């Protein structure tokens, strides 16, 4: 079909230890236009695709508050590819972590971006 140009890949989804923790990267790549909000977000088995944090167009952070002080982003527009802080990987956290990257295009169009989500397997 018909498809955007910009296109996302997550780093990640490795295997750490119970406690441990674990940086995701999500690297934007095909448009040089400012991309408008980014976010991770986290399937677990036995529930939905949970938002775990949004940046919005000014960098503004919304986070879940099972995530608060635990998990941390940050959004480079084009320099750096955007990266989530995972701290304190409990055995059951063990779930695929999604990337959404989401563009106000031209003047009322809106795109939602969605990645490749990798699983991150928590040892115990």
């Known amino acids: 079909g018909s498809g955007s140009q910009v296109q996302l890949v997550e780093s990640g989804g490795g295997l750490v230890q119970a406690g441990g923790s674990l940086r995701l990267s999500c690297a934007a790549s095909?448009?040089?236009?400012?991309?408008?909000?980014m976010g991770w977000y986290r399937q677990a088995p036995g529930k939905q695709r949970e938002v775990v944090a949004t940046?919005?167009?000014?960098?503004?952070?919304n986070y879940a508050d099972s995530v608060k002080g635990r998990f941390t982003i940050s959004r480079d527009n084009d320099k750096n590819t955007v990266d989530l802080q995972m701290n304190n990987l409990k055995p059951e956290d063990t779930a695929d972590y999604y990337c959404?990257?989401?563009?106000?295009?031209?003047?009322?169009?809106?795109?939602?971006?969605w990645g490749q989500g990798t699983q991150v397997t928590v040892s115990s």
């Open positions: 959404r990257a989401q563009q106000k295009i031209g003047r009322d169009t809106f795109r939602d971006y």
């Open positions: 095909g448009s040089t236009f400012s991309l408008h909000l």
């Open positions: 940046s919005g167009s000014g960098g503004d952070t």
